[PDB]
Design a protein around this nucleic acid. Structure first.
Ligand SMILES: OC[C@H]1O[C@@H](O)[C@H](O)[C@H]1O
Lengths: 420, 14
DNA sequence: TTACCGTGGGAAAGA
DNA sequence: AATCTTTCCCACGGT
């Protein structure tokens, strides 16, 4: 017999207490492939995070029902999706995150794009499911020609996210990633920051508030790097193209994936953003002999830039543990309002066993495909007892619910607007 | 079309 | 020490 | 042929 559907009381309980479980997958948008028997590791290393208060709540519920600490521990493996390459275990003991430092894609795989696959279950072998990263583009190696904006794929738009790493003399053990920790920038061996790269116009002054411009990042432009987690920023920088061990002052072609970059601290005396072991400092460049358009920079001042992405999934066991995996987790991108009032949901991983709930009111739902659903908007009187029309605006949460009670929250609300 | 950095870190010198 | 290994620069092969 | 991308090769300086 089928499992219990979500009750209105269970929905009300969730809406008060919350306790969502969230899986984040942070990773680069491209990856260089490996030939033969070699291993060219994904850099930065994909990082899985277990976010939100629901992990601790689930852990306590499980141990209440008689699980040991080890039985309640989440486990996770990661691999190339749809692939013969083996999965690799992630160690999450004592942490809510783990990086995958030795992934690579062999040229045995002929795909042009792929996804990472994260398989999760608890210590008592209770299943959680399989979570997919965003799509990752395979490259053979970065081109040496100037980047064309026709390949928007490999360019970097203002306001998107990048990682930055430094590596000394081709040694994998020396890789260090720009990262913010304890209110300070540092260069980490194990953790990496995902930084907004904001384009500023040339006359934009220093400050914490600044006007950002749209477009693709080019060498010679002024940029602001902002940690997407801490909000900490660096002073204004001029991103310059690295050629051998010199920064080119006159290059102005588009920045491309995996290019080597230098960051000149704007309005300084040839000071460049520079690592020294784990320390982040500024280090003065040396003028090149005869050539006035290049400056010699420190080993620590050359940074590989790479665009990064984020997959995020949120679920809640609204009627308790279930037999089916909670995956694939639906994600709602947008709501659009459309006889009867219909609300259209656009996103991914929709299934015909989902229903849209407005607040605690389950709505009639029409499945179309994995990216599109329609539902009928409940009468306002389902939320305001006497109203025969919308007297004042009324805002309710929009939530996806599966037929076995799994609850998939959205960040999105619906607002009944008064009739003018 | 305007961003808000929470804090701007000072970069120490060599 | 020897054996082994990512990595980046180049050579070679392919379109 | 010529030129850019893909694949193959290998040594530096790390474990
Ligand atoms: O002779 C080339 C080498 O010289 C150093 O400055 C660089 O790290 C290498 O390219």
């Amino acid at each position: 017999s089928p499992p219990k559907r979500l009750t209105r009381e269970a929905m009300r309980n969730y809406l008060k207490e919350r306790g969502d479980q969230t899986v984040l997958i942070l990773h680069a948008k491209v990856a260089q492939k490996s030939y033969g028997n070699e291993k060219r590791f994904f850099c930065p290393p994909p990082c899985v995070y277990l976010m939100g208060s629901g992990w601790k709540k689930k852990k306590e519920q499980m141990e209440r029902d008689g699980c040991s600490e080890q039985e309640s521990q989440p486990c996770a493996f990661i691999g190339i999706g749809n692939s013969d390459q083996e999965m690799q275990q992630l160690n999450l003991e004592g942490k809510n995150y783990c990086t995958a430092k030795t992934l690579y894609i062999s040229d045995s795989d002929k795909r042009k794009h792929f996804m990472l696959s994260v398989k999760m279950f608890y210590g008592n072998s209770d299943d959680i499911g399989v979570f997919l990263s965003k799509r990752i583009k395979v490259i053979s190696k970065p081109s040496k020609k100037k980047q064309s904006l026709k390949n928007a794929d490999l360019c970097i738009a203002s306001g998107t996210k990048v990682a930055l790493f430094n590596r000394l003399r081709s040694q994998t053990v020396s890789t260090r990633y720009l990262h913010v920790e304890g209110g300070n920038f540092h260069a980490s061996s194990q953790q990496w920051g995902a930084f907004y790269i904001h384009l500023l116009d040339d006359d934009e002054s220093e400050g914490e508030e600044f006007t950002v411009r749209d477009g693709y990042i080019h060498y010679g432009q002024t940029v602001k790097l902002v940690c997407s987690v801490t909000g900490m920023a660096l002073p204004r920088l001029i991103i310059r193209k690295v050629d051998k061990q010199t920064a080119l002052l006159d290059a102005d072609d588009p920045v491309s994936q995996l290019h080597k970059c230098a960051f000149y601290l704007k309005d300084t005396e040839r000071m460049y953003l520079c690592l020294s072991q784990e320390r982040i400092i500024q280090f003065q460049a040396t003028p090149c002999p005869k050539e006035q358009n290049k400056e010699m920079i420190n080993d620590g001042a050359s940074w590989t830039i790479i665009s990064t992405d984020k997959a995020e999934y949120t679920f809640y066991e609204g009627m308790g543990p279930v037999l089916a995996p909670v995956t694939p987790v639906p994600v709602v991108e947008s709501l659009q309002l459309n006889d009867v009032a219909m609300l259209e949901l656009t996103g991914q991983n929709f299934t015909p066993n989902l229903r849209v709930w407005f607040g605690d009111v389950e709505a009639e739902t029409m499945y179309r495909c994995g990216e599109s659903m329609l539902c009928v908007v409940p009468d306002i009187s389902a939320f305001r007892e006497g109203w025969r029309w919308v007297r004042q605006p009324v805002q309710v949460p929009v939530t996806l619910v599966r037929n076995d009670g799994v609850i998939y929250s959205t960040s999105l609300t619906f607002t009944y607007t008064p009739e003018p | 079309k305007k961003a808000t950095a929470t804090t701007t870190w000072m970069v120490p010198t060599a």
